[PDB]
């Protein structure tokens, strides 16, 4: 968390209040109780470790080895909170531009391609599983090229991308991102291209 004497005093208070927990496994089981009530011990343990892996600051990674840097980031966040508590720093002022970032066409298109490609890979896997189940095995292994080629469904990707761009309804709840281009005159079109 830090080295400041008041910071370490507050942390001593918090640690005294947190002497109930003993080891990491007890904390994992406690979170498992939090996330999966009524389930088996192992199930809660595993699915709470999953939450720790990929719901607590995923931008640090999702590997089980990423514990220490995530802990350091959380400690710095806590230090910021307590520093604000002591008046050592002012508010964030989120209206400031440093906290604002524009979502350009490329980033949004990347997100749309991500969701569409996820759907596409699910459909492809389903198709190959069906083909292996129903045709057989020697067919698929005899001609891998055909078995891969005639199982892709490009229309699944094309329809979703085209519909998302046309309607303006975006995956993740975003709406109105894509608008009809205004062509009344020169100024209207150019102004619409910069909004």
């Amino acid at each position: 968390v830090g080295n400041d004497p008041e910071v370490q005093q507050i942390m001593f208070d918090n640690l005294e209040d947190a002497s109930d927990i003993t080891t990491q496994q007890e904390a994992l089981e406690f979170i498992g109780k939090l996330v999966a009530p009524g389930q088996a011990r192992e199930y809660r343990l595993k699915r709470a470790e999953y939450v720790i892996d990929n719901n607590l600051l995923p931008h640090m990674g999702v590997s089980p080895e990423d514990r220490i840097k995530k802990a350091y980031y959380l400690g710095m966040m806590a230090l910021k909170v307590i520093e604000l508590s002591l008046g050592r720093r002012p508010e964030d002022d989120k209206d400031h531009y440093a906290n604002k970032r524009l979502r350009l066409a490329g980033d949004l298109l990347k997100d749309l391609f991500r969701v569409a490609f996820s759907q596409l890979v699910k459909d492809i896997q389903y198709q190959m599983t069906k083909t292996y189940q129903r045709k057989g095995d020697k067919y698929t292994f005899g001609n891998i090229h055909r078995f891969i080629r005639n199982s892709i469904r490009p229309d699944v990707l094309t329809e979703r991308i085209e519909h998302a761009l046309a309607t303006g309804a975006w995956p993740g709840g975003r709406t109105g991102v894509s608008q009809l281009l205004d062509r009344t005159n020169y100024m209207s079109t150019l102004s619409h291209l910069r909004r």
């Binding site: 599983t129 069906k130 189940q133």
Partner: protein, 81 residues
């Protein structure tokens, strides 16, 4: 310990094959699969517990969820005879 899993109306037969192929990939401990035609959109899974069912039902198509509880074997004989 028999469990019952809910599927879409018209693809229970295909979902049975999908489960039968899926069990090999990770070597799941599933003992048998029963999908009678007297129940629409429901299949029966033989598993030691709920967790293995949840793991084996993750990515298979047309499957929505597994009904909580363990259906007694005494209510099944007149389906498999």
């Amino acid at each position: 310990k028999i469990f019952a899993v809910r599927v879409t109306h018209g693809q229970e037969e295909t979902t049975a094959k999908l489960i039968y192929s899926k069990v090999r990939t990770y070597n799941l401990p599933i003992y048998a699969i029963l999908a009678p035609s007297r129940v629409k959109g429901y299949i029966f899974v033989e598993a030691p517990n709920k967790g293995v069912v949840d793991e084996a039902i993750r990515g298979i198509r047309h499957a929505r969820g597994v009904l909580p509880g363990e259906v007694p074997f005494k209510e099944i004989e007149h389906f498999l005879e």
